[PDB]
Amino acid sequence: GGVTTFVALYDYESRTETDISFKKGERLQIVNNTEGDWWLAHSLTTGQTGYIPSNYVAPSD
Numbered sequence: 317g318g319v320t321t322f323v324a325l326y327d328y329e330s331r332t333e334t335d336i337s338f339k340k341g342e343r344l345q346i347v348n349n350t351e352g353d354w355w356l357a358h359s360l361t362t363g364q365t366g367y368i369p370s371n372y373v374a375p376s377d
Contacts, residue, residue, distance in 0.1 A: 321345055321360070323376030328369065336366035344373060 322344045330337040335354070338344065342361040349355075354367045 318350065319346070319375040321376050322357075322373040324373055326372050328372050330366075332367070334367050336364040336368060338362070338364070338368065338372075343376060344368060 324338050324340050324342045324344060327340050328335075328338050336357070336359065338359055338361075342359050344357040344359050347356040347358060347365075350370065353370055355370050355373075356366070357368045357373075358365045
């Protein structure tokens with residue numbers, strides 16, 4: 317298996333119908349896979365669920 321939890325490296329403001337906003341430091345779990353530029357994610361911090369830009373996160377605890 318792959319990375320369990322990712323951390324936001326930057327703030328991100330939602331701009332679509334299917335993405336989510338998140339703040340730097342939020343912990344996010346990827347739902348499908350990490351293929352592509354947009355990952356379906358769930359914020360463990362806020363409970364939000366939606367797509368995030370993959371270059372805004374990195375593996376974390």
